[PDB]
PDB file of all heavy atoms in Angstrom:
ATOM      1  N   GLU A  13      14.629 -16.626 -14.978  1.00 27.33           N
ATOM      2  CA  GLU A  13      16.055 -16.298 -14.850  1.00 27.33           C
ATOM      3  C   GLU A  13      16.311 -14.790 -14.818  1.00 27.33           C
ATOM      4  O   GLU A  13      15.775 -14.046 -15.645  1.00 27.33           O
ATOM      5  CB  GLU A  13      16.884 -17.002 -15.966  1.00 27.33           C
ATOM      6  CG  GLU A  13      18.374 -16.940 -15.763  1.00 27.33           C
ATOM      7  CD  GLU A  13      18.890 -17.905 -14.664  1.00 27.33           C
ATOM      8  OE1 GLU A  13      18.197 -18.885 -14.402  1.00 27.33           O
ATOM      9  OE2 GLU A  13      19.997 -17.726 -14.169  1.00 27.33           O
ATOM     10  N   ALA A  29      23.688 -22.451   9.057  1.00 14.65           N
ATOM     11  CA  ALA A  29      25.004 -23.062   8.865  1.00 14.65           C
ATOM     12  C   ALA A  29      25.392 -23.071   7.440  1.00 14.65           C
ATOM     13  O   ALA A  29      26.569 -22.776   7.071  1.00 14.65           O
ATOM     14  CB  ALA A  29      25.025 -24.471   9.490  1.00 14.65           C
ATOM     15  N   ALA A  38      17.296  -5.070  -6.759  1.00 28.09           N
ATOM     16  CA  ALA A  38      17.176  -5.692  -8.073  1.00 28.09           C
ATOM     17  C   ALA A  38      16.625  -4.758  -9.128  1.00 28.09           C
ATOM     18  O   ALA A  38      15.598  -4.161  -8.962  1.00 28.09           O
ATOM     19  CB  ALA A  38      16.316  -6.963  -7.985  1.00 28.09           C
ATOM     20  N   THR A  44       9.452  -2.946 -15.429  1.00 26.59           N
ATOM     21  CA  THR A  44      10.447  -2.491 -16.371  1.00 26.59           C
ATOM     22  C   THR A  44      11.293  -1.331 -15.840  1.00 26.59           C
ATOM     23  O   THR A  44      10.697  -0.311 -15.460  1.00 26.59           O
ATOM     24  CB  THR A  44       9.826  -2.186 -17.753  1.00 26.59           C
ATOM     25  OG1 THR A  44       9.086  -3.352 -18.216  1.00 26.59           O
ATOM     26  CG2 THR A  44      10.893  -1.999 -18.789  1.00 26.59           C
ATOM     27  N   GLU A  63      22.915 -29.519  -0.403  1.00 21.24           N
ATOM     28  CA  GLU A  63      22.124 -28.297  -0.058  1.00 21.24           C
ATOM     29  C   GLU A  63      21.730 -27.538  -1.304  1.00 21.24           C
ATOM     30  O   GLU A  63      20.660 -26.903  -1.380  1.00 21.24           O
ATOM     31  CB  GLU A  63      22.935 -27.371   0.898  1.00 21.24           C
ATOM     32  CG  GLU A  63      22.929 -27.829   2.347  1.00 21.24           C
ATOM     33  CD  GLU A  63      23.909 -28.958   2.666  1.00 21.24           C
ATOM     34  OE1 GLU A  63      25.059 -28.953   2.116  1.00 21.24           O
ATOM     35  OE2 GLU A  63      23.511 -29.867   3.445  1.00 21.24           O
ATOM     36  N   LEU A  74       8.322 -23.457  -5.366  1.00 14.71           N
ATOM     37  CA  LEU A  74       7.806 -22.104  -5.365  1.00 14.71           C
ATOM     38  C   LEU A  74       7.206 -21.811  -6.719  1.00 14.71           C
ATOM     39  O   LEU A  74       6.178 -21.078  -6.748  1.00 14.71           O
ATOM     40  CB  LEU A  74       8.952 -21.093  -5.011  1.00 14.71           C
ATOM     41  CG  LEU A  74       9.334 -21.077  -3.543  1.00 14.71           C
ATOM     42  CD1 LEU A  74      10.533 -20.133  -3.305  1.00 14.71           C
ATOM     43  CD2 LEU A  74       8.186 -20.671  -2.633  1.00 14.71           C
ATOM     44  N   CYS A 104       9.915  -8.183   2.763  1.00  2.00           N
ATOM     45  CA  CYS A 104       8.825  -7.873   3.671  1.00  2.00           C
ATOM     46  C   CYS A 104       9.426  -6.986   4.776  1.00  2.00           C
ATOM     47  O   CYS A 104      10.159  -7.466   5.635  1.00  2.00           O
ATOM     48  CB  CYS A 104       8.225  -9.170   4.260  1.00  2.00           C
ATOM     49  SG  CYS A 104       7.436 -10.218   3.002  1.00  2.00           S
ATOM     50  N   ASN A 118       4.162  -2.900  24.528  1.00  2.00           N
ATOM     51  CA  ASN A 118       3.884  -1.593  25.051  1.00  2.00           C
ATOM     52  C   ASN A 118       3.154  -0.701  24.060  1.00  2.00           C
ATOM     53  O   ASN A 118       2.942   0.500  24.283  1.00  2.00           O
ATOM     54  CB  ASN A 118       5.165  -0.912  25.538  1.00  2.00           C
ATOM     55  CG  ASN A 118       4.967   0.310  26.410  1.00  2.00           C
ATOM     56  OD1 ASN A 118       4.254   0.200  27.425  1.00  2.00           O
ATOM     57  ND2 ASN A 118       5.628   1.402  26.091  1.00  2.00           N
ATOM     58  N   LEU A 133      -4.512  -8.531  15.083  1.00  2.00           N
ATOM     59  CA  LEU A 133      -4.253  -9.907  15.448  1.00  2.00           C
ATOM     60  C   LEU A 133      -5.126 -10.912  14.722  1.00  2.00           C
ATOM     61  O   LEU A 133      -4.684 -11.895  14.245  1.00  2.00           O
ATOM     62  CB  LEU A 133      -4.359 -10.108  16.965  1.00  2.00           C
ATOM     63  CG  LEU A 133      -3.093  -9.925  17.828  1.00  2.00           C
ATOM     64  CD1 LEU A 133      -1.972  -9.128  17.200  1.00  2.00           C
ATOM     65  CD2 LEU A 133      -3.478  -9.474  19.219  1.00  2.00           C
ATOM     66  N   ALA A 148      -2.513 -25.586   0.460  1.00  2.00           N
ATOM     67  CA  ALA A 148      -3.247 -26.853   0.434  1.00  2.00           C
ATOM     68  C   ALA A 148      -3.888 -27.090  -0.959  1.00  2.00           C
ATOM     69  O   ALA A 148      -3.939 -28.246  -1.455  1.00  2.00           O
ATOM     70  CB  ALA A 148      -4.327 -26.939   1.523  1.00  2.00           C
ATOM     71  N   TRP A 199       5.765 -27.035  17.951  1.00  2.00           N
ATOM     72  CA  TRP A 199       4.787 -26.733  16.875  1.00  2.00           C
ATOM     73  C   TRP A 199       4.204 -27.980  16.250  1.00  2.00           C
ATOM     74  O   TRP A 199       3.320 -27.844  15.395  1.00  2.00           O
ATOM     75  CB  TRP A 199       5.447 -25.827  15.845  1.00  2.00           C
ATOM     76  CG  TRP A 199       5.622 -24.401  16.286  1.00  2.00           C
ATOM     77  CD1 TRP A 199       4.779 -23.347  16.014  1.00  2.00           C
ATOM     78  CD2 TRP A 199       6.635 -23.876  17.141  1.00  2.00           C
ATOM     79  NE1 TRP A 199       5.229 -22.231  16.642  1.00  2.00           N
ATOM     80  CE2 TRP A 199       6.365 -22.504  17.314  1.00  2.00           C
ATOM     81  CE3 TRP A 199       7.749 -24.444  17.738  1.00  2.00           C
ATOM     82  CZ2 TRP A 199       7.201 -21.682  18.116  1.00  2.00           C
ATOM     83  CZ3 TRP A 199       8.620 -23.657  18.542  1.00  2.00           C
ATOM     84  CH2 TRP A 199       8.316 -22.296  18.714  1.00  2.00           C
ATOM     85  N   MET A 200       4.744 -29.125  16.636  1.00  2.00           N
ATOM     86  CA  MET A 200       4.415 -30.384  15.907  1.00  2.00           C
ATOM     87  C   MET A 200       3.249 -31.160  16.524  1.00  2.00           C
ATOM     88  O   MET A 200       3.107 -31.266  17.755  1.00  2.00           O
ATOM     89  CB  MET A 200       5.669 -31.285  15.854  1.00  2.00           C
ATOM     90  CG  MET A 200       6.698 -30.795  14.862  1.00  2.00           C
ATOM     91  SD  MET A 200       8.349 -31.394  15.224  1.00  2.00           S
ATOM     92  CE  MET A 200       8.188 -33.161  14.697  1.00  2.00           C
ATOM     93  N   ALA A 201       2.425 -31.723  15.640  1.00  2.00           N
ATOM     94  CA  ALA A 201       1.311 -32.607  16.060  1.00  2.00           C
ATOM     95  C   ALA A 201       1.806 -33.913  16.596  1.00  2.00           C
ATOM     96  O   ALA A 201       2.926 -34.398  16.211  1.00  2.00           O
ATOM     97  CB  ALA A 201       0.340 -32.776  14.838  1.00  2.00           C
ATOM     98  N   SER A 214      -1.581 -31.853   9.998  1.00  2.00           N
ATOM     99  CA  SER A 214      -0.514 -31.534  10.963  1.00  2.00           C
ATOM    100  C   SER A 214      -0.095 -30.070  10.824  1.00  2.00           C
ATOM    101  O   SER A 214       0.217 -29.472  11.871  1.00  2.00           O
ATOM    102  CB  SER A 214       0.670 -32.522  10.874  1.00  2.00           C
ATOM    103  OG  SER A 214       1.363 -32.391   9.632  1.00  2.00           O
ATOM    104  N   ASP A 269      -9.414 -26.453  18.898  1.00  2.00           N
ATOM    105  CA  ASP A 269      -9.967 -27.181  17.745  1.00  2.00           C
ATOM    106  C   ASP A 269      -8.782 -27.690  16.856  1.00  2.00           C
ATOM    107  O   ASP A 269      -8.743 -28.858  16.467  1.00  2.00           O
ATOM    108  CB  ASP A 269     -10.876 -26.315  16.885  1.00  2.00           C
ATOM    109  CG  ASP A 269     -12.177 -26.059  17.567  1.00  2.00           C
ATOM    110  OD1 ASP A 269     -12.635 -26.689  18.572  1.00  2.00           O
ATOM    111  OD2 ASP A 269     -12.940 -25.121  17.138  1.00  2.00           O
ATOM    112  N   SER A 282      -9.702 -24.338   4.907  1.00  2.00           N
ATOM    113  CA  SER A 282     -10.983 -23.729   4.382  1.00  2.00           C
ATOM    114  C   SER A 282     -11.952 -23.341   5.444  1.00  2.00           C
ATOM    115  O   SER A 282     -12.580 -22.260   5.407  1.00  2.00           O
ATOM    116  CB  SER A 282     -11.572 -24.631   3.273  1.00  2.00           C
ATOM    117  OG  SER A 282     -10.853 -24.515   2.085  1.00  2.00           O
TER     118      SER A 282
END
Side-chain angles (χ1 to χ4, degrees):
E13 192 75 20
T44 304
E63 280 80 40
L74 287 174
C104 297
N118 197 50
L133 266 23
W199 285 262
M200 287 157 72
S214 66
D269 290 345
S282 283

